[PDB]
Amino acid sequence: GSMSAEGYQYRALYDYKKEREEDIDLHLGDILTVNKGSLVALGFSDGQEAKPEEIGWLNGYNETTGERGDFPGTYVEYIGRKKISP
């Protein structure tokens, strides 16, 4: 059941198609996951994992399709932030 934690999560809102090699295919119910204590993944130090409106690009991955890449914080909805583990 994975060898690591999940971290914080964001529930997709609408089906979005990608156009850049940076962006990936986004579907409904697609939950994305980040780091548990290394949101600095991007270089941030204050973004409030709860409000994507202030964050620009979020980089994460969707195990739903086992795909990964970047997505704007204007098509998902933050749901929960905590040290989630099996």
Which CATH number does the domain housing residue 10 bear?
2.30.30.40
d(CA 52, CA 47): 8
d(CA 83, CA 78): 15
Q: What is the experimental method?
A: NMR
Strand-by-strand arrangement of the 31-33 sheet: 67-72, 57-62, 31-33, 9-12, 76-80
d(CA 85, CA 82): 9
Residue 78's DSSP bridge partners are 10
CB 13 within 8 A of CB 76: yes
Q: Which amino acid is at 80?
A: G
Count how many domains the chain has: 1
> What domain range is 10 assigned to?
1-86
Residue 8: other Cβ atoms inside 10 A: 21
